[PDB]
Amino acid sequence: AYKIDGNEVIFTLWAPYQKSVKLKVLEKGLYEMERDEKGYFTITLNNVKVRDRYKYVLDDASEIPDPASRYQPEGVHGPSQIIQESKEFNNETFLKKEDLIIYEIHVGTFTPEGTFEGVIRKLDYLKDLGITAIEIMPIAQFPGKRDWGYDGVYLYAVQNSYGGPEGFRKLVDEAHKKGLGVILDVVYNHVGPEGNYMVKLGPYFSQKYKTPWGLTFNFDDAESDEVRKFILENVEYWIKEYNVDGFRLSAVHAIIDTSPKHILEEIADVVHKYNRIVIAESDLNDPRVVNPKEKCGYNIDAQWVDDFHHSIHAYLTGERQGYYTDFGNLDDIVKSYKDVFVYDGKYSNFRRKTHGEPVGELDGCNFVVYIQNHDQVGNRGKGERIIKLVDRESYKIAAALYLLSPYIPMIFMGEEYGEENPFYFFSDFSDSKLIQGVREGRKKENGQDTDPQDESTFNASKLSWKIDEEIFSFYKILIKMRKELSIACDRRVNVVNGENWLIIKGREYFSLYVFSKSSIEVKYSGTLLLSSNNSFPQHIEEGKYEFDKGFALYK
């Protein structure tokens, strides 16, 4: 991209497809760029400063922003701009994996402001809630102002309308001051479809592979060294330039690499070199994502386990459309509590193949579980939070199953005070072919009836901030109890279950999940810490009991 060096500055653009590229500093010049054989164009410049805008003009004299742009002040079609280069970073994250409770935020909708500034304003509320890290949905510059972020198209540019680079940096500084970590959701498996100029430059994209997202990055074919470098330098950049604590990697099953060292192992290497954390979204149900190198693994810190969410959702909602078909039984939930994956090398009707592998002896903290998140709400055509699909008792029973699980729990913005608003899928393209593809895609795939390119759709998705105090108090206590009971990471749990109930016992507690009024046989003594209603005794002893629907936590 660029590197500020004393009072001069070096511009480097990878562009093997190109014979001839000129740097165009808006209102200062065209300047010819020097070309090496590997395809790099360079030039040093003396007359450049922060706030300066630029482009690159190609063989065909068309003009494009720096794919490695640090900031796109006027969008995905506007010029790149030089930014401040404050490269200050702690060598360590203060986050400890065993203490991680994650809160997923979508900046645009978190807050009436719609910006990082708005998130700084909620820091106190979060700290007080007991969250220990916030996960920020992708902020790589995407088209327009309304997008979940997966259509990001400038990996190094903080989205203009969220507050850009200053906003984000201020977010992480303030987060740290309050003692919260920030985790950044990054997308290395694909690039969005408007405002991407990389095809014009070089083989950024594999000709070898299709993913659910179409074209993937080229990590293993001709000229791929440079493209490995682009991604690997992006993880470095978020760490040195913004002091981020860690990453969530989007859809690692769509990152293909047949090299002797998988790019995923290399990504994890960068993050660990700088003592950070990485978490993977994986559809593979394969421990190699998360195993040590000595175990043939990429050594990623943890992975999402959709199986735990699916088990819960399918069982409590009675839904079986989509991936839900592979779930539904109370057995699925105990399986996920015990073995992490429901699909650990068993046939899937949904997928029409055997799926998964056991996970062996890894502890709870290699995995992340949740009852809601941006996909599990957002990919429903009507975007209904789960709070609309089960009764109050169930919703509490759900919140407890995951917050008291041995795995790292992730709260979805609003879940904790009982938000009822939908979280719709929205976008903000301006290419009419794209606009029409998305509305038709979305309707046909998801049954989305709201128009995603319509602003009302994004308005409807903004948190209400309408606190339900009974739910909020319940979450807050759950989180406190998890810490005190030393529940994190510990998979030495005993689980009994009857038809309509479950008891889960750990080292220091036991929980009653009663789905439906039942006569349960309780093998434990203990004193009540929290409960979903008032029907549970303050002190309980080994015996048979008739309970009503609800949850209680003992000892």
Swiss-Prot record:
> Where is the protein situated, by its record's location annotation?
Cytoplasm
Q: Does the keyword Cytoplasm apply?
A: yes
- The catalytic residues are S250 (nucleophile), E281 (proton donor)
Q: What is its EC number?
A: 3.2.1.141
Q: Where does substrate bind?
A: 248-253, 306-310, 374-379
Per the UniProt entry, the disulfide pairs are none
Which pathway features in its UniProt record? Glycan biosynthesis; trehalose biosynthesis
Which Pfam families is this protein grouped with? Alpha-amyl_C (PF09071), Alpha-amylase (PF00128)
One GO BP annotation is: trehalose biosynthetic process
Q: Could you tell me the keywords of this UniProt record?
A: Carbohydrate metabolism, Cytoplasm, Glycosidase, Hydrolase
**Reaction(s) catalysed by this chain's protein:** hydrolysis of (1->4)-alpha-D-glucosidic linkage in 4-alpha-D-[(1->4)-alpha-D-glucanosyl]n trehalose to yield trehalose and (1->4)-alpha-D-glucan
The record ties this protein, via SUPFAM superfamilies, to: (Trans)glycosidases, E set domains, Glycosyl hydrolase domain
Q: Name one GO cellular component term.
A: cytoplasm
**Main location per UniProt?**
cytoplasm
Q: Where is this site: Transition state stabilizer?
A: D375
Membrane-traversing stretches:
none
**MF GO annotations:** 4-alpha-D-(1->4)-alpha-D-glucanotrehalose trehalohydrolase activity
What InterPro entries does its record include?
Answer: Glyco_hydro_13_cat_dom, Glyco_hydro_b, Glycoside_hydrolase_SF, Ig-like_fold, Ig_E-set, Maltooligo_trehalose_arc_C, Trehalose_TreZ, Trehalose_TreZ_E-set_sf
NCBIfam families in the cross-refs: trehalose_TreZ
Tell me its family.
Belongs to the glycosyl hydrolase 13 family.
Complexes and interactors: Homodimer.
Q: Return the protein name.
A: Malto-oligosyltrehalose trehalohydrolase
